[PDB]
RNA sequence: AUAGCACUCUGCAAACACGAAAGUGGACGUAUAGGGUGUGAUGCCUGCCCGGUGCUGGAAGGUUAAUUGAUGGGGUUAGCG
């Protein structure tokens, strides 16, 4: 319903959040949780390689089953949980033999629903099948690119791709960016669309909200000195230059793709 | 600086950054995500110009590198005188 908070304080005036009353409220499933540590955007040389990263709340990693290789064994959904590592919700699955796993929760999936994976899985949301066995025209998520590697495409909240056709050994899918591309027909995908589709309707409201998520402030190149940035310098406000990055790469319209090994797998570019 | 806004790049062995390389951060993330740029709650709004510079997409005419080596011109001497 997208609640807007009442302006009892200026930092609260513009806060907009979402309720999801069906999410589990207790602790996560301990055997599938492992420790994670903050990096600060620094690599093994100790240098900053990604600016504006640091701080934020402490988080545990949730072991999510992207491969879905427990074939032929039906499972039931126990609960839906909030995952701090991503924008989608996760679903805890209990299989018929007692094992428990985590999966990306499709939209509409609730406690008590049944899921399955394999060639003969029924066509239901949350079921995992090879693209060869998927009906043409369906909407899918968690698309896998290499056989046996697991889902890589369309995993964020509200994600989905469309299966437009399947010719030869390659299926044709349209991605959310607008790109049409081929995927080998033995790669697997999941029926349905990713949950939490209202994720992008939230408003943080204040700087502290971003600080809680671990984003440090961005400083414009215009505000610097010439030694720091190509945009730096000048008396007063003046741009006087075609915009570039701190390392001199143009920022408005200049294309940066250089890979030549995967070019054959893209059939229609989305006007990059 | 900021929440909010917009443009733009990036299909994942992602773009981007560090490094001589191996490798590492991005991210144990996957376009509702990540980087760069500008503007700066909110209300009402945001007009005209693509000639210049840049960017993006065309075109296969003119010009042009290495490479290749057709011809022509000389040096030398067996011989003829």
Swiss-Prot record:
Residues 228-238 have a biased composition (Basic and acidic residues). It comes from the Bacteria. GO terms for biological process: cytoplasmic translation. GO terms for molecular function: rRNA binding; structural constituent of ribosome; transferase activity. The keyword rRNA-binding applies. Keywords: Ribonucleoprotein, Ribosomal protein, RNA-binding, rRNA-binding. Transmembrane segments: none annotated. Pfam families: Ribosomal_L2 (PF00181), Ribosomal_L2_C (PF03947). InterPro entries: NA-bd_OB-fold, Rib_uL2_dom2, Ribosomal_uL2, Ribosomal_uL2_bac/org-type, Ribosomal_uL2_C, Ribosomal_uL2_dom3, Ribosomal_uL2_RNA-bd_dom, Translation_prot_SH3-like_sf. One of its GO terms (cellular component) is large ribosomal subunit. Gene3D superfamilies: 2.30.30.30, Nucleic acid-binding proteins (2.40.50.140), Ribosomal protein L2, domain 3 (4.10.950.10). Residues 37-56, 223-255 are annotated as: Disordered. The keyword Kinase does not apply. One of the primary rRNA binding proteins. Required for association of the 30S and 50S subunits to form the 70S ribosome, for tRNA binding and peptide bond formation. It has been suggested to have peptidyltransferase activity; this is somewhat controversial. Makes several contacts with the 16S rRNA in the 70S ribosome. PANTHER family: LARGE RIBOSOMAL SUBUNIT PROTEIN UL2M, RIBOSOMAL PROTEIN L2. Part of the 50S ribosomal subunit. Forms a bridge to the 30S subunit in the 70S ribosome. Belongs to the universal ribosomal protein uL2 family. This is Large ribosomal subunit protein uL2. It comes from Acinetobacter baumannii (strain AB0057). The lineage of its organism: Bacteria, Pseudomonadati, Pseudomonadota, Gammaproteobacteria, Moraxellales.
């Amino acid at each position: 319903p997208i609640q807007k908070c009442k302006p009892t304080s200026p930092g609260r005036r513009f806060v907009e959040k979402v309720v999801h009353d069906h999410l589990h409220k207790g602790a996560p499933y301990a055997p599938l949780v492992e420790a994670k540590k903050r990096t600060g955007g620094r690599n093994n040389n100790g240098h900053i390689t990604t600016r504006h990263v640091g701080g934020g709340h402490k988080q545990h990693y949730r072991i999510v089953d992207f491969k879905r290789n427990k074939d032929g064994v039906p499972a039931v959904v126990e609960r839906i949980e909030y995952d701090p590592n991503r924008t989608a919700h996760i679903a805890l699955l209990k299989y018929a033999d007692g094992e428990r796993r985590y999966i990306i929760a499709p939209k509409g999936l609730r406690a008590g629903d049944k899921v399955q994976s394999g060639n003969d899985a029924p066509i239901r949301p949350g079921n995992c099948l090879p693209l060869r066995n998927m009906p043409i025209g369906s909407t899918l998520h968690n698309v896998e690119l290499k056989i046996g590697k697991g889902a890589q495409l369309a995993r964020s909240a509200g994600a989905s791709v469309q299966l437009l056709g399947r010719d030869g050994s390659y299926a044709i899918i349209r991605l959310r960016s607008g790109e049409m591309r081929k995927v080998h027909v033995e790669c697997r995908a999941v029926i349905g669309e990713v949950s939490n589709q209202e994720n992008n309707l939230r408003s943080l409201g204040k700087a502290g909200a971003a600080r809680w998520r671990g984003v440090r402030p961005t400083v414009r190149g215009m505000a610097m000195n010439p030694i720091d940035h190509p945009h730096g310098g000048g008396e007063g406000r003046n741009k006087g230059i075609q915009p570039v990055s701190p390392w001199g790469q143009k920022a408005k319209g200049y294309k940066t793709r250089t890979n030549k090994r995967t070019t054959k797998m893209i059939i229609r570019d989305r006007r990059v």
